[PDB]
Amino acid sequence: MKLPTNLAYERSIDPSDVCFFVVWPDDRKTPLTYNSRTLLGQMEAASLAYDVSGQPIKSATAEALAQGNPHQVDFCHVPYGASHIECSFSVSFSSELRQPYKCNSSKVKQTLVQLVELYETKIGWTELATRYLMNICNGKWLWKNTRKAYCWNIVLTPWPWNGEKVGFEDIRTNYTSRQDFKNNKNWSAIVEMIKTAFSSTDGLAIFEVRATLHLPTNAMVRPSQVFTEKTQNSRVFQSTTIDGERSPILGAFKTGAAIATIDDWYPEATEPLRVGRFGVHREDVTCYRHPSTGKDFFSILQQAEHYIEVLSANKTPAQETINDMHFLMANLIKGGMFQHK
Amino acid sequence: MKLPTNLAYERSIDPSDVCFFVVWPDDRKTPLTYNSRTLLGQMEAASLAYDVSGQPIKSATAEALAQGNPHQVDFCHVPYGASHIECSFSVSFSSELRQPYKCNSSKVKQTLVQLVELYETKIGWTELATRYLMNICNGKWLWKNTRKAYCWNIVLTPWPWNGEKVGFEDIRTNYTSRQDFKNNKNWSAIVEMIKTAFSSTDGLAIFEVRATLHLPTNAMVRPSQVFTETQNSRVFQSTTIDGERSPILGAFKTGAAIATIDDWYPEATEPLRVGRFGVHREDVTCYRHPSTGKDFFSILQQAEHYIEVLSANKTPAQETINDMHFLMANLIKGGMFQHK
Fold it and tell me: What is the DSSP track for B229-249?
């Protein structure tokens, strides 16, 4: 199947920013603040003592290395008498993957409408909606604040819902594997909103999420930080205006890239990845699912004729040809433009 | 081996600010405060009476050099009727050193994973975890307040812990050496935390520290002061505790006190802060300079060599296990080690 010169989708999952508030012993909440401040560190770089050759530069003598290196960082921390910290955002699962957003080829459009119809008939939205909702229901979207903390709690408020706000207390101790989440009081109900918000032609499914972090005394909190385009700022935080005070926030896209760390289908997978075309692992800077592997998105998307006669035939398909369908559907939920030429 | 173009670790020891309180008799607490007060000194600088060379300037007469010199400092002290001063913070011991935070070469990653696992087998974390933990249990992070005090006391509160708060009484006359610290009742159980903190892929081990400094009457206290860029010649760092500015010990100033360990550099008398080519800032030089070959980067490139020493049957020399503690203590320190 030759690609069009216009193909684009809209995303199905719409997160938002995460706001940090300080809860005192009494019922009073305040926007968390920060401050830029200058430190004086050592002069360790290995480009300040070694040139490209490798034997040491002689301009950097033993007196010079101990001189002192003043720099400036933004600095955020929990205040002294505080009790914990609130963190809140909102998600929306919205069925935008049913048909393309723009597609100048009718035969490619009828291909990608039949896949999404044959997928939920034969495979189902149970695996994707379970994997997407695990990263909301435990603090994946709190990135490093989950680490080095006493206990963190999540409280859900699903919108087309009757009552009794869904909560997850002491997530590290009680919510570890999938079977811990299925032992929740209402896990079947919140998965079934996301299965219907991908099935109906108007599925909506708004969640209101809210955290509670218990850190040590006077501890450090780490928000997302901006793309910067006699002391130069070495750490600049992202921020939003709450009331009249500058407060740190978690990137709207930093939050939606925590929900979609799902891709553990890649050819020799251990640790799951953020879903994308030829999926990158930014820790160790490589692409798994490289085009030379043939298991990226476009090499799967051009097998879209072959995947239909697999799913329509009554022999139930192998695990190799469903983990290519999970990866294909979870890229249509991610969005993006899919053109060539 | 060779340093990749990306290598970076995160750290394993995260301290906080130290906040100073004033304990009144009847046991009510108040945050310690301060005030900028001006003064008027003599005119001693040697650049006011001698030139760039060294012969005396003829403008600085006897009368014009006895003229008085007014300035400004911040001045913190204990209130008159007080009893003592609290100081409080918290440390977290994490296992960030197990794998690189970011590394674009997978030959170097799988070498720097194996050294950690050959170090906890042939040597173990007992020597490093004892050295980090003493600098809390005697008030090293109380820098100058320790000096000129009657006594001070430390009380720990470890987090994955059952009960019976660990306490150190009269540190100046009670705990002086290592075997003085190994005679506390619960000291094995706290070194076993930092061992189990470093040994797993999620080890956590939070501590809660709180000191109790009995000062003389009306004595100065010395917090950490800002890098400023009449005028203020000493500006303290500060936070807000009850809507009142109060001095604090720098979070980075505290973290450099738990990490004054390094007495392995080849003329070791006094321990240094752990750094790449470890500097001594009193007498401004670098020990472990790259001309010695005993900095961090001329040891980390011998990382492959250490795998063919630590995997054998024999217990190696101090020349090659002191330089394994130094390889480890810079991975706990964190930082970026890439070149080109």
Answer: ----S--B-EEESSSSEEEEE
A234 touches A37 (CB < 8 A): no
Interface of B with A in 44-83 (CB under 8 A): none
> Resolution in angstroms for this experimental structure?
3.2
Question: Which of the 8 DSSP states describes residue A220?
Answer: B
Q: What gap in Å lies between CA B251 and CA A220, rounded to an integer?
A: 10
Within 8 A of A81 by CB-CB distance, chain B residues are 241-242
User: Using an 8 Å Cβ cutoff, are B49 and B187 in contact?
Assistant: no
Inter-chain CB proximity B252 and A41 less than 8 Å = yes
Question: Experimental method for this entry?
Answer: cryo-EM
Helices B188-199 and B126-137 pack at an angle, to 10 degrees, of 120
Integer angstrom CA distances of residue B142 from A323, B137, B168: 58, 11, 15
Report residue B13 as tokens. Answer: 């020891």
Tell me how far apart the alpha carbons of residues A117 and A119 are, in angstroms, rounded to a whole number: 5
CA distance A300 to chain B (A): 27
Q: Do A231 and B226 touch (CB under 8 A)?
A: no
The angle formed by the CA atoms of residues A335, A337 and A338, to the nearest 5 degrees, is 110
* Chain A environment of B290 (Cβ under 8 Å): 49-50, 56
